[PDB]
């Protein structure tokens, strides 16, 4: 129909970090409607896609994707940590991200 969404909206927030040192290998993800670690346990393992655009066409497309997985929950408010195939660029802190429903367990 009008909606075709098969993923949950989400947001690239930080890298895993200290006060003064970040670690590009782990990204922090806020998932729409997930408020607690208990809620967030659902998404552990789900796969994330950061979808972006580019000028050069490649394998016949101007759209590219960086793929990753959710790995564990983070803190008390349903934030989640995730790792990616290649660490996310960091211009993308605050960019949208897609959390799929596979691998599924329902």
């Amino acid at each position: 129909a009008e909606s075709h969404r098969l993923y949950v909206k989400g947001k690239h927030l930080s890298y895993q970090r200290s006060k003064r040192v970040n670690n590009p290998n782990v990204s922090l993800i806020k998932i729409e409607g997930v408020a607690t670690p208990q809620d967030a346990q659902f998404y552990l393992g789900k796969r994330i896609a950061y979808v972006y655009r580019a000028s050069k066409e490649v394998r016949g497309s101007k759209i590219r994707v960086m793929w990753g997985k959710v790995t564990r929950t983070h803190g008390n408010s349903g934030v989640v940590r995730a790792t990616f195939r290649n660490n996310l660029p960091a211009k993308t802190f605050g960019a949208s991200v897609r959390i799929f429903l596979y691998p599924s367990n329902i």
Binding site: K11, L13, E32, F93, G94
Partner: protein, 197 residues
């Protein structure tokens, strides 16, 4: 959640409105705040006035032009509380701040777009009852801001038009309810009851 969130400043506490606005920006949520003149600061009026003159003395001794800038407007006071909570000399910070717009009164677009509130910074929900506090509009005018009267006037005008809009709407949903009524007690209706509707 929505592309742009319009916050009705009235009855909010500056630094708590600030703290949540900065956060939403940093996470990529565009925000526009309205009626910043109806913002609050805890502590009675005199204290915050004193606090503001403390601010006023700070300036670059050799050249007052390069020194700290004292914006008098209730929106710019507000922006200051905000900017202070955003790593604003980084590109990421600049980015965040562009997602922000702050206003006195509710000017067009936003007067016909819905505004929300932020309960964790609602004065009436946070301050112990009894405690003295301060309206931004009044604090500003006393330190130079020139346009309380003309905001007040425009608002009063705007408020007339919106009570009409409202009156109409409330009249249109009396009919709409007088619809959900025949339809009541019908097969489709109790079927929908069954499923929680």
């Amino acid at each position: 959640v929505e592309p742009v969130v319009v916050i009705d400043g009235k009855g909010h506490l500056v630094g708590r409105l600030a703290s949540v606005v900065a956060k939403q920006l940093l996470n990529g949520q565009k925000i526009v705040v309205v009626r910043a003149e109806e913002l609050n600061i805890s502590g009675e009026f005199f204290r915050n006035k004193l606090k503001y003159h403390d601010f006023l003395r700070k300036a670059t001794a050799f050249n007052k032009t390069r020194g700290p800038f004292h914006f008098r407007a209730p929106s710019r006071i507000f922006y200051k509380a905000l900017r202070g909570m955003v790593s604003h000399k980084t590109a990421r910070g600049k980015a965040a701040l562009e997602r922000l717009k702050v206003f006195e009164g509710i000017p067009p677009p936003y007067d016909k777009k819905k505004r929300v509130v932020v309960p964790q910074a609602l004065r009436v929900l946070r301050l112990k009852p009894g405690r003295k506090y301060t309206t931004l509009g009044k604090l500003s005018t006393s330190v130079g801001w020139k346009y309380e009267d003309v905001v007040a006037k425009l608002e009063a005008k705007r408020k007339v038009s919106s009570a009409e809009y409202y009156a109409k709407k409330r009249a249109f949903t009396k009919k709409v309810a007088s619809a959900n009524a025949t339809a009541a007690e019908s097969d489709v209706a109790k079927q929908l009851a069954a499923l929680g509707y």
